[PDB]
């Protein structure tokens, strides 16, 4: 798992029995802005009397878990994070996944300090987050989330761990349960309108539940006017589906289903509930194994009233497998992130052809042997999942989940033989999409299943309207036939280091070298700078800050094979051919003639230059060579392709036969990592 904010659990817990007492949190303040901004802000009346008390302080017997970490522990506090909370309640039905999120062995009595940890699925990686045990309490009792018995604390700390990843408590205000589910599972969220069930919906619930998937539901809201429905059902409110059973009550077979209300109080009325002599009509044998009689917000209802009353039903499966199917499949995963940014990459959907073509694009190879004829249709099954990163943390500024969705195009068979394969503005004006997301919706993730013939396809993710800023990532799940996979692409480069000798050099260059060098004969570092500025003030396109001297020196101490201070002919001829191509790429990739490389463009420029990097890495290059608007001017571009063409070059050759590994002592480690 990746360590969130790069803090470690076991290097904190160690650092107490050597430091003193109980531990605060630099990463995540217990100061009055680790809470809210507006509606629960630093001084909206609402916020006051509130105190960060540890479990030791408001509870003689501070426990972590007691009577298992079960679903009766989770009970909503003063915040609208039912969505997430419902998610937690249904998590505890699987024991051994709860494991992953909750390291159950924590205490207050062992080698303890005040720090805690949880693991979370986050936009494609598993991430472990640490918090301190201090929690928001007012008066005696707890305020946000709280247990059944009031000296159990795990579920409240988890809540705090989920706010930390989201900036603050108030940000957790509202969303979908599947946001929670996936953040616990990394699973595949299938949805269902309860107006339009598929046939075996009821049998799906049972499969799902058996299959250890995650389930939850909710009645939606319509504009204009009050909350609670008079059968006692909370409107616009996350509930957690928990039990699936069909049992013949004297007369007819009964479809029944167990839900849980995250309040932990207020169960539904009128029909089939808890204090209802319809339970007279059922056999005691499986009855006294399945139905209780106490208010915990948990209850049953007919599948009929369940269909009548609930609007939405979200489900999270721990595989891309569908539950309509009854057999397990093999699946490859392909991950890719990107950004929309107004001006360069924020395109809108196809409804806006003037911009649409400036979103990022993504290849999708559906391959011959992965074809099946299943379900009548013949093709390759796959799943696209587009998901907004970190949207919940821009809630401070006011913003929220955009309206997202995607479209798929068939690359024409004449591009088939190509890497640089980008799709034109006019291309989208002459070609309908081949497949596409259901709609565009303002969910955090939109993901559907597809089946197309083997071939190459472009994936175009977008908001509905252009000019919307935001980051995303994509999960593509391929169905595969078990005779491959375990195959993992890796960081590779591709030099083109040729053209030594006079034969390959030219008499033009030969003659023109003589000119520019002047007296000192080899071209100095200060000389190459004069050159770079000239071109910089010649080329109309090619935005640049200017080429610094610290960079030119670097260019010499790269092609300075013989060793001397400066650049001789062959040495310079190579340098030029290299700047020539860095330029051809920059040109060819700069399809909006900004004269600059945006995120996506960079990724494509690096690829055209031979490098093959993981997302983590592209994302470092960007974060390091890019200005605030997330863009790279020509000089940074060269600096970047230079540095990298060196790092790789230095790796190979220090590792000639491809032991994926290399070894360095201190002094020379400095001398590579800082210079030559």
């Amino acid at each position: 798992a990746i360590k969130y904010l790069n803090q470690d659990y076991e290097t904190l817990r160690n650092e107490c029995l050597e430091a003193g007492a109980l531990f605060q949190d630099p990463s995540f303040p217990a100061l009055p802005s680790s809470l809210g901004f507006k509606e629960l802000g630093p001084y909206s009346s609402k916020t006051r009397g509130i105190e960060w008390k540890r479990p030791t302080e408001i509870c003689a017997d501070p426990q972590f878990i007691i009577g298992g970490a079960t679903r009766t522990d989770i009970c909503q506090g003063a915040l609208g994070d039912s969505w997430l909370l419902a998610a937690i309640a249904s998590l505890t039905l699987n024991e051994e996944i709860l494991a992953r999120v909750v390291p159950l062995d924590q205490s207050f009595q062992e080698n303890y300090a005040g720090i805690f940890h949880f693991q979370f699925w986050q936009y494609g990686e598993w991430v472990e987050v640490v918090v301190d045990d201090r929690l928001p309490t007012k008066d005696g009792e707890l305020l946000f989330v709280h247990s059944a018995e009031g000296s159990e604390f795990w579920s409240a700390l988890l809540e705090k761990a989920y706010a930390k990843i989201n900036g603050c408590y108030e940000a957790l205000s509202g969303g979908a349960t599947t946001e929670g589910f996936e953040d616990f599972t990394g699973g595949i969220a299938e949805w269902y309108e309860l107006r339009k069930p598929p046939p075996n919906l009821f049998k799906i619930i049972q499969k799902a539940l058996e299959k250890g998937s995650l389930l939850g539901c909710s009645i939606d809201i319509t504009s204009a006017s009050e909350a609670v429905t008079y059968q006692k059902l909370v409107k616009g409110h996350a509930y957690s589906v928990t039990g699936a059973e069909e049992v013949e009550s004297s007369g007819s077979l009964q479809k029944l289903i167990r839900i849980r209300n995250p309040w932990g109080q207020v169960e539904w009325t009128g029909k089939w509930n808890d204090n209802c002599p319809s339970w007279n009509t059922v056999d005691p044998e499986v009855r006294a194994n399945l139905t209780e009689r106490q208010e915990d917000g948990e209850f049953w209802m007919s599948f009929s009233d369940f269909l009548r009353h609930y609007s939405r039903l979200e489900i999270c499966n721990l595989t891309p497998d569908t539950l309509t199917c009854d057999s397990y499949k093999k699946w490859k995963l392909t991950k890719m992130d990107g950004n929309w940014r107004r001006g360069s990459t924020a395109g809108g959907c196809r409804n806006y052809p003037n911009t649409f073509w400036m979103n990022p694009q993504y290849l999708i190879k559906l391959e011959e042997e992965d074809e099946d004829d299943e379900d009548g249709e013949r093709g390759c099954t796959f799943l696209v999942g587009l998901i907004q990163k970190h949207r919940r943390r821009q809630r401070k500024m006011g913003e929220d989940m955009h309206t997202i969705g995607f479209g798929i195009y068939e690359v024409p068979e004449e591009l088939t033989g190509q890497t640089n394969i980008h799709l034109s503005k006019n291309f989208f004006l002459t070609t309908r999409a081949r497949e596409r997301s259901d709609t565009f919706i303002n969910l955090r993730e939109v993901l559907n299943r597809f089946k197309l013939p083997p071939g190459e396809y472009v994936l175009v993710p977008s908001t509905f309207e252009p000019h919307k800023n935001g980051d995303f990532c994509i999960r593509v799940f391929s169905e595969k036939k078990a005779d491959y996979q375990t195959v993992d692409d890796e960081i590779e480069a591709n030099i083109e280091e040729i053209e030594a000798n006079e034969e390959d050099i030219g008499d033009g260059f030969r003659r023109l070298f003589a000119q520019l060098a002047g007296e000192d004969a080899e071209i100095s570092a200060f000389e190459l700078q004069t050159i770079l500025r000239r071109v910089l003030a010649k080329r109309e396109d090619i935005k640049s800050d200017g080429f610094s001297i610290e960079t030119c020196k670097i260019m010499v101490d790269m092609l300075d094979e013989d060793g001397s201070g400066k650049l001789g002919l062959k040495e310079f001829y190579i340098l030029w051919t290299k700047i020539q191509k860095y330029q051809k790429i920059y040109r060819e990739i700069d399809v909006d003639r900004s004269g600059t490389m945006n995120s996506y463009e960079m990724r494509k420029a690096l690829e055209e230059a031979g490098f093959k990097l993981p997302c983590q890495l592209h994302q470092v290059i960007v974060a390091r060579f890019a200005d605030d608007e997330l863009i790279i001017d020509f000089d940074n571009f060269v600096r970047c392709l230079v540095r990298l063409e060196i790092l790789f070059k230095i790796f190979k050759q220090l590792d000639p036969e491809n032991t994926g590994t290399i070894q360095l002592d201190l002094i020379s480690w400095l001398s590579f990592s800082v210079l030559g």
Partner: protein
């Protein structure tokens, strides 16, 4: 001459409606926050010269 150097850098219908939709985020209404807990929420109980200082 330098001019001559720089020259070496490269010589000189159908609509397809996409429909959208809007889904209300859950629990963004205060009517959804517990009664027992709604209770609690009311009630009630120069710039850079100090850096210069570090040099001399």
């Amino acid at each position: 001459a330098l001019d001559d150097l720089i020259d070496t850098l490269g010589e000189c219908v159908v609509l397809d409606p996409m429909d959208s939709t809007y889904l209300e985020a859950l629990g963004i209404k205060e009517g959804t926050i517990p009664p027992e807990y709604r209770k609690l929420l009311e009630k009630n109980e120069h710039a850079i010269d100090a850096l210069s200082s570090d040099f001399t």
